[PDB]
N, CA and C of each residue as an Amber inpcrd file, in Angstrom:
protein
   417
  -9.7120000 -16.4890000   2.8290000  -8.6840000 -15.7710000   3.6330000
  -8.7910000 -14.2840000   3.3320000  -8.4210000 -13.4660000   4.3060000
  -8.4910000 -12.0160000   4.1730000  -7.1000000 -11.4300000   3.9920000
  -6.9940000 -10.4810000   3.0630000  -5.7330000  -9.8330000   2.7340000
  -5.1020000  -9.0420000   3.8610000  -3.7970000  -8.8260000   3.7250000
  -3.0390000  -8.0390000   4.6810000  -3.6830000  -6.6590000   4.5840000
  -3.8430000  -5.9900000   5.7210000  -4.4510000  -4.6740000   5.7280000
  -5.9370000  -4.6770000   6.0510000  -6.5640000  -5.8470000   6.0350000
  -7.9880000  -5.9230000   6.3400000  -8.2050000  -5.4590000   7.7850000
  -9.0520000  -4.4530000   7.9720000  -9.3140000  -3.9340000   9.3070000
 -10.4770000  -4.6120000  10.0140000 -10.2410000  -4.9840000  11.2700000
 -11.2280000  -5.6740000  12.0890000 -11.5950000  -4.8850000  13.3490000
 -12.8830000  -4.6000000  13.5080000 -13.3850000  -3.8520000  14.6600000
 -13.6230000  -4.7420000  15.8830000 -13.0700000  -4.3420000  17.0240000
 -13.2610000  -5.0820000  18.2660000 -14.3520000  -4.3380000  19.0370000
 -15.5510000  -4.9320000  19.1510000 -16.6720000  -4.3020000  19.8600000
 -16.4810000  -4.1260000  21.3610000 -15.5770000  -4.9000000  21.9500000
 -15.3390000  -4.8100000  23.3830000 -14.4620000  -3.6160000  23.7390000
 -13.3470000  -3.4680000  23.0340000 -12.4370000  -2.3590000  23.2950000
 -12.7540000  -1.1570000  22.4140000 -13.4140000  -1.3960000  21.2870000
 -13.7370000  -0.3100000  20.3770000 -12.5430000   0.0010000  19.4890000
 -11.5200000  -0.8470000  19.5750000 -10.3060000  -0.6850000  18.7840000
 -10.3930000  -1.4500000  17.4760000  -9.8370000  -0.8700000  16.4150000
  -9.8210000  -1.5120000  15.1050000  -8.4060000  -2.0030000  14.7970000
  -8.2730000  -3.2950000  14.5050000  -6.9660000  -3.8930000  14.2350000
  -6.7470000  -4.3390000  12.7930000  -5.4900000  -4.3480000  12.3560000
  -5.1780000  -4.8420000  11.0230000  -4.9980000  -6.3270000  11.2670000
  -5.6020000  -7.1470000  10.4200000  -5.5370000  -8.5850000  10.6110000
  -4.1310000  -9.1880000  10.7050000  -3.1570000  -8.6150000   9.9960000
  -1.7970000  -9.1570000  10.0500000  -1.1220000  -8.9240000  11.3990000
  -1.5900000  -7.9300000  12.1450000  -1.0210000  -7.6620000  13.4540000
  -1.6830000  -8.5690000  14.4760000  -2.9710000  -8.8360000  14.2760000
  -3.7270000  -9.7140000  15.1630000  -3.1150000 -11.1220000  15.1180000
  -2.7550000 -11.5640000  13.9170000  -2.1690000 -12.8880000  13.7200000
  -0.7070000 -12.9040000  14.1610000   0.0660000 -11.9370000  13.6790000
   1.4720000 -11.8680000  14.0400000   1.6950000 -11.7680000  15.5400000
   0.7490000 -11.1590000  16.2480000   0.8990000 -11.0150000  17.6850000
  -0.0080000 -11.9210000  18.4870000  -0.7580000 -12.7670000  17.7860000
  -1.6920000 -13.6810000  18.4260000  -2.4890000 -12.9060000  19.4640000
  -3.0680000 -11.7920000  19.0190000  -3.8600000 -10.9530000  19.8960000
  -5.2450000 -11.5600000  20.0790000  -5.6460000 -11.8000000  21.3370000
  -6.9550000 -12.3800000  21.6470000  -8.0530000 -11.3270000  21.6050000
  -8.2050000 -10.6650000  20.4640000  -9.2250000  -9.6310000  20.3370000
 -10.6150000 -10.2430000  20.2380000 -11.6190000  -9.3890000  20.3680000
 -12.9930000  -9.8170000  20.1910000 -13.3700000  -9.2090000  18.8500000
 -14.3890000  -9.7650000  18.2130000 -14.8350000  -9.2570000  16.9280000
 -16.3480000  -9.1680000  16.9850000 -16.9480000  -8.5590000  15.9730000
 -18.3940000  -8.5210000  15.9200000 -18.6300000  -9.7390000  15.0440000
 -19.3530000 -10.7030000  15.5850000 -19.6400000 -11.9270000  14.8610000
 -21.1320000 -12.0000000  14.5820000 -21.4850000 -12.6180000  13.4600000
 -22.8770000 -12.7590000  13.0690000 -23.3320000 -14.1930000  13.2750000
 -24.5130000 -14.3530000  13.8600000 -25.0750000 -15.6750000  14.0790000
 -25.7770000 -16.0810000  12.7880000 -26.7140000 -17.0160000  12.9060000
 -27.4800000 -17.4950000  11.7640000 -28.6590000 -16.5630000  11.4950000
 -29.4990000 -16.3840000  12.5110000 -30.6900000 -15.5480000  12.4100000
 -30.4150000 -14.0730000  12.1330000 -29.2260000 -13.7730000  11.6200000
 -28.8830000 -12.4000000  11.2890000 -28.6200000 -11.4320000  12.4290000
 -28.3070000 -11.9400000  13.6180000 -28.0160000 -11.0560000  14.7470000
 -26.5110000 -10.9950000  15.0150000 -26.0630000  -9.8560000  15.5290000
 -24.6550000  -9.6230000  15.8250000 -24.3130000  -9.8400000  17.2990000
 -23.1430000 -10.4290000  17.5490000 -22.6640000 -10.7000000  18.9040000
 -21.1520000 -10.5200000  18.9740000 -20.6400000 -10.2780000  20.1750000
 -19.2040000 -10.1430000  20.3580000 -18.6580000 -11.5370000  20.6570000
 -17.6190000 -11.9330000  19.9280000 -16.9920000 -13.2420000  20.1130000
 -15.4630000 -13.1170000  20.0750000 -14.7620000 -13.8750000  20.9290000
 -13.3020000 -13.8090000  20.9630000 -12.5810000 -14.6210000  19.8960000
 -11.4070000 -14.1400000  19.5060000 -10.5680000 -14.8210000  18.5280000
  -9.7150000 -15.7980000  19.3330000  -9.7800000 -17.0820000  18.9740000
  -9.0500000 -18.1270000  19.6890000  -7.8760000 -18.7580000  18.9340000
  -7.8190000 -18.5670000  17.6200000  -6.7230000 -19.1080000  16.8120000
  -6.3560000 -18.0900000  15.7580000  -5.1090000 -18.1560000  15.3010000
  -4.5900000 -17.2230000  14.3160000  -3.8570000 -17.9710000  13.2170000
  -4.1630000 -17.6560000  11.9630000  -3.5130000 -18.3390000  10.8500000
  -2.9030000 -17.4160000   9.8020000  -1.6200000 -17.6140000   9.5040000
  -0.9260000 -16.8480000   8.4670000  -1.1110000 -17.7380000   7.2370000
  -1.8920000 -17.2690000   6.2700000  -2.2000000 -18.0530000   5.0740000
  -1.2690000 -17.9120000   3.8790000  -0.1720000 -17.1840000   4.0480000
   0.7570000 -17.0120000   2.9460000   0.2160000 -16.0980000   1.8650000
   0.9390000 -16.0130000   0.7530000   0.5560000 -15.1540000  -0.3590000
  -0.4050000 -15.8500000  -1.3160000  -1.4670000 -15.1420000  -1.6960000
  -2.4830000 -15.6810000  -2.6010000  -3.1910000 -14.5630000  -3.3740000
  -4.0390000 -14.9460000  -4.3250000  -4.8020000 -13.9700000  -5.0990000
  -5.9820000 -13.4950000  -4.2590000  -6.1200000 -12.1820000  -4.1170000
  -7.2310000 -11.5970000  -3.3740000  -7.9660000 -10.6380000  -4.3060000
  -9.2880000 -10.7560000  -4.3700000 -10.0710000  -9.8640000  -5.2160000
 -10.6220000  -8.7420000  -4.3530000 -11.0060000  -7.6420000  -4.9870000
 -11.5370000  -6.5210000  -4.2400000 -13.0070000  -6.2400000  -4.4990000
 -13.7570000  -6.0630000  -3.4240000 -15.1720000  -5.7550000  -3.5300000
 -15.3560000  -4.3370000  -3.0070000 -15.6370000  -3.3870000  -3.8960000
 -15.8470000  -1.9970000  -3.4680000 -17.3210000  -1.8160000  -3.1500000
 -17.6080000  -1.4280000  -1.9150000 -18.9830000  -1.2720000  -1.4620000
 -19.4530000   0.1720000  -1.3790000 -20.7600000   0.3620000  -1.5140000
 -21.3460000   1.6870000  -1.4150000 -20.8040000   2.2690000  -0.1210000
 -20.2370000   3.4690000  -0.1970000 -19.6780000   4.0920000   0.9870000
 -18.1660000   4.2010000   0.9380000 -17.5320000   3.4320000   0.0530000
 -16.0800000   3.4860000  -0.0800000 -15.2800000   2.2600000   0.3460000
 -15.7660000   1.5340000   1.3490000 -15.0630000   0.3490000   1.8320000
 -14.7560000  -0.6370000   0.7100000 -13.5890000  -1.2700000   0.7930000
 -13.1770000  -2.2710000  -0.1780000 -12.6670000  -3.4780000   0.5940000
 -13.3400000  -4.6090000   0.4210000 -12.9400000  -5.8480000   1.0750000
 -12.0170000  -6.6010000   0.1170000 -10.8460000  -6.9990000   0.6090000
  -9.8900000  -7.7530000  -0.1980000  -9.7880000  -9.1570000   0.3780000
 -10.3270000 -10.1310000  -0.3430000 -10.3000000 -11.5030000   0.1370000
 -10.0320000 -12.4630000  -1.0040000  -9.7670000 -13.7200000  -0.6650000
  -9.5320000 -14.7260000  -1.6830000 -10.8990000 -15.0110000  -2.3050000
 -10.9410000 -15.3050000  -3.6110000 -12.2200000 -15.5830000  -4.2720000
 -13.0880000 -16.6660000  -3.6360000 -12.5040000 -17.4820000  -2.7660000
 -13.2720000 -18.5350000  -2.1100000 -13.8190000 -18.1040000  -0.7440000
 -13.4230000 -16.9230000  -0.2650000 -13.8750000 -16.4680000   1.0520000
 -15.3820000 -16.1910000   1.0950000 -16.0590000 -16.7410000   2.1020000
 -17.5010000 -16.5660000   2.2370000 -17.8690000 -15.2220000   2.8310000
 -18.8320000 -14.5740000   2.1860000 -19.3450000 -13.2750000   2.5740000
 -20.8580000 -13.3860000   2.7250000 -21.4130000 -12.7500000   3.7480000
 -22.8510000 -12.7840000   3.9460000 -23.4980000 -11.7920000   2.9790000
 -24.4280000 -12.2790000   2.1610000 -25.1010000 -11.4340000   1.1810000
 -26.6180000 -11.4970000   1.2870000 -27.2910000 -10.7290000   0.4360000
 -28.7490000 -10.7010000   0.4120000 -29.3030000 -12.0820000   0.0630000
 -28.4450000 -12.9440000  -0.4750000 -28.8530000 -14.2920000  -0.8500000
 -28.1000000 -15.3500000  -0.0420000 -27.6950000 -14.9780000   1.1650000
 -26.9770000 -15.9100000   2.0180000 -25.4690000 -15.8340000   1.8570000
 -24.7710000 -16.8160000   2.4100000 -23.3200000 -16.8430000   2.3300000
 -22.8340000 -17.3460000   0.9720000 -22.1030000 -16.4960000   0.2590000
 -21.5650000 -16.8340000  -1.0530000 -20.0590000 -16.5610000  -1.1040000
 -19.3570000 -17.2560000  -1.9980000 -17.9210000 -17.0560000  -2.1520000
 -17.7430000 -15.6730000  -2.7520000 -16.7280000 -14.9520000  -2.2830000
 -16.4590000 -13.6020000  -2.7630000 -16.2970000 -13.5340000  -4.2800000
 -15.7440000 -14.5960000  -4.8550000 -15.5180000 -14.6340000  -6.2880000
 -16.7670000 -14.7550000  -7.1390000 -17.9080000 -15.0300000  -6.5110000
 -19.1700000 -15.1720000  -7.2370000 -19.9350000 -13.8660000  -7.2750000
 -19.5280000 -12.9280000  -6.4260000 -20.2060000 -11.6460000  -6.3290000
 -19.9220000 -10.6930000  -7.4760000 -20.9580000  -9.9620000  -7.8650000
 -20.8590000  -9.0190000  -8.9640000 -21.4410000  -7.6620000  -8.5980000
 -21.1120000  -6.6670000  -9.4060000 -21.6190000  -5.3170000  -9.2160000
 -23.1440000  -5.4070000  -9.1150000 -23.7190000  -4.8090000  -8.0760000
 -25.1600000  -4.8550000  -7.9150000 -25.6080000  -5.7190000  -6.7490000
 -24.8490000  -6.7650000  -6.4430000 -25.1860000  -7.6410000  -5.3190000
 -25.0100000  -6.8650000  -4.0160000 -25.8160000  -7.1840000  -3.0120000
 -25.7130000  -6.4830000  -1.7380000 -25.1020000  -7.3720000  -0.6720000
 -24.1080000  -6.8390000   0.0300000 -23.4320000  -7.5810000   1.0780000
 -23.8760000  -7.0300000   2.4270000 -23.7790000  -7.8540000   3.4640000
 -24.1510000  -7.4480000   4.8170000 -23.0150000  -6.6260000   5.4210000
 -23.3650000  -5.4700000   5.9690000 -22.3960000  -4.5700000   6.5800000
 -22.8580000  -4.1230000   7.9700000 -21.9040000  -3.7970000   8.8310000
 -22.2330000  -3.3170000  10.1620000 -22.2150000  -1.7950000  10.0930000
 -23.3190000  -1.1550000  10.4590000 -23.3650000   0.3060000  10.4350000
 -22.4150000   0.8360000  11.5070000 -21.4720000   1.6840000  11.1100000
 -20.4910000   2.2280000  12.0480000 -21.1070000   3.0890000  13.1570000
 -22.3190000   3.5900000  12.9290000 -22.9920000   4.4260000  13.9220000
 -23.9260000   3.6650000  14.8530000 -24.8100000   2.8650000  14.2700000
 -25.7810000   2.1130000  15.0460000 -25.2810000   0.7510000  15.4810000
 -24.2330000   0.2610000  14.8290000 -23.7180000  -1.0480000  15.1780000
 -24.6900000  -2.1120000  14.7050000 -25.7160000  -1.6730000  13.9780000
 -26.7240000  -2.5810000  13.4510000 -26.3660000  -3.1110000  12.0750000
 -26.9370000  -4.2610000  11.7520000 -26.7170000  -4.9120000  10.4760000
 -27.6010000  -4.3050000   9.3810000 -27.0480000  -4.2070000   8.1840000
 -27.7970000  -3.7110000   7.0400000 -27.0900000  -4.2520000   5.8150000
 -27.5580000  -3.8780000   4.6330000 -26.9360000  -4.3690000   3.4200000
 -26.5600000  -3.2420000   2.4840000 -25.3950000  -3.3800000   1.8580000
 -24.9020000  -2.3770000   0.9330000 -24.5540000  -3.0020000  -0.4100000
 -24.7580000  -2.2120000  -1.4540000 -24.5120000  -2.6190000  -2.8240000
 -23.0360000  -2.5990000  -3.1980000 -22.5950000  -3.6520000  -3.8760000
 -21.2230000  -3.7240000  -4.3590000 -21.1850000  -2.7870000  -5.5640000
 -20.3260000  -1.7750000  -5.5000000 -20.2100000  -0.8090000  -6.5840000
 -19.2840000  -1.2780000  -7.6930000 -18.2770000  -2.0630000  -7.3280000
 -17.3260000  -2.5450000  -8.3220000 -16.5130000  -3.7400000  -7.8270000
 -16.2100000  -4.6520000  -8.7430000 -15.4100000  -5.8220000  -8.4200000
 -14.0210000  -5.5450000  -8.9870000 -13.0170000  -5.5320000  -8.1160000
 -11.6450000  -5.2610000  -8.5340000 -10.8850000  -6.5300000  -8.9250000
  -9.9240000  -6.4030000  -9.8620000  -9.1000000  -7.5170000 -10.3450000
  -8.2440000  -8.0730000  -9.2060000  -7.7440000  -9.2930000  -9.3650000
  -6.9150000  -9.9000000  -8.3300000  -5.5420000  -9.2480000  -8.2090000
  -4.9370000  -9.4310000  -7.0430000  -3.6040000  -8.9230000  -6.7660000
  -3.0350000  -9.8410000  -5.6970000  -1.7180000 -10.0110000  -5.7030000
  -1.0570000 -10.8810000  -4.7400000  -0.9120000 -10.1960000  -3.3840000
  -1.1060000 -10.9560000  -2.3140000  -0.9840000 -10.3890000  -0.9810000
  -0.9470000 -11.4640000   0.0870000  -0.2750000 -11.1710000   1.1920000
  -0.2250000 -12.1120000   2.2940000  -1.6680000 -12.1880000   2.7630000
  -2.1540000 -13.3850000   3.0760000  -3.5220000 -13.5130000   3.5500000
  -3.5640000 -14.1280000   4.9440000  -4.6560000 -13.8630000   5.6500000
  -4.8040000 -14.3460000   7.0100000  -6.1740000 -14.9300000   7.3280000
  -6.2300000 -15.6650000   8.4290000  -7.4740000 -16.2690000   8.8490000
  -7.4840000 -16.2920000  10.3600000  -8.6620000 -16.4750000  10.9370000
  -8.7990000 -16.5130000  12.3800000  -9.8560000 -17.5270000  12.7430000
  -9.8960000 -17.9030000  14.0120000 -10.9410000 -18.7940000  14.4660000
 -11.7250000 -17.9580000  15.4650000 -12.9680000 -17.6380000  15.1290000
 -13.8040000 -16.8610000  16.0330000 -14.6890000 -17.8600000  16.7530000
 -14.6370000 -17.8400000  18.0790000 -15.3980000 -18.7780000  18.8930000
 -16.8890000 -18.8890000  18.6060000 -17.3530000 -20.1310000  18.4610000
 -18.7590000 -20.4510000  18.2130000 -19.3830000 -20.0490000  16.8760000
 -19.3500000 -18.7570000  16.5690000 -19.9700000 -18.2450000  15.3480000
 -19.0950000 -18.2160000  14.0920000 -17.7840000 -18.3220000  14.2710000
 -16.8320000 -18.3440000  13.1600000 -17.0460000 -17.3190000  12.0480000
 -17.4010000 -16.0970000  12.4330000 -17.6040000 -15.0310000  11.4680000
 -17.1110000 -13.7510000  12.1100000 -16.9660000 -12.7120000  11.3030000
 -16.4970000 -11.4190000  11.8080000 -16.7640000 -10.2960000  10.8160000
 -16.6180000  -9.0580000  11.2850000 -16.8140000  -7.8800000  10.4470000
 -15.4270000  -7.3700000  10.0650000 -15.1340000  -7.4040000   8.7650000
 -13.8540000  -6.9730000   8.2230000 -14.1480000  -5.8490000   7.2450000
 -13.4770000  -4.7140000   7.4230000 -13.7120000  -3.5570000   6.5660000
 -15.2010000  -3.2050000   6.5810000 -15.8730000  -3.5610000   7.6780000
 -17.2870000  -3.2620000   7.8310000 -18.2320000  -4.2930000   7.2470000
 -17.6680000  -5.2970000   6.5880000 -18.4480000  -6.3420000   5.9430000
 -18.4600000  -7.6260000   6.7710000 -19.6150000  -8.2820000   6.8300000
 -19.7340000  -9.5330000   7.5730000 -19.1680000 -10.6490000   6.6890000
 -18.1720000 -11.3600000   7.2130000 -17.5330000 -12.4430000   6.4720000
 -17.2040000 -13.6420000   7.3630000 -16.8230000 -14.7480000   6.7340000
 -16.4520000 -15.9450000   7.4780000 -15.0650000 -15.6990000   8.0800000
 -14.7360000 -16.3620000   9.1870000 -13.4330000 -16.1390000   9.8010000
 -12.2640000 -16.7200000   9.0010000
């Protein structure tokens, strides 16, 4: 699950939404979703889930972005999809370049301690993945 405040880019409108507003308003936004072969596609959000309060860890990535997710949340990495809680400083996560919209990988600069926060989830059609805080993750 992704923490309150997690920003999600909609490739269709070009608008960036906070996940808690997308869920609270059941907004049918589109997201940048990643397939298997490492390609990016636009996919619509069809379901919204308020996951309640849970422990979310922070992954600070080269460039400043910090992804806050539950330690069990799957993130696309240089070694495939791994739980966020298994990642360590030095591992590279898949990120969407804000300029080219292309996929690349960035180094995790620091792993932050857990903190309590409302968490959310979504159902992304077909591909069930999305770019949150610029990072490719499971929905």
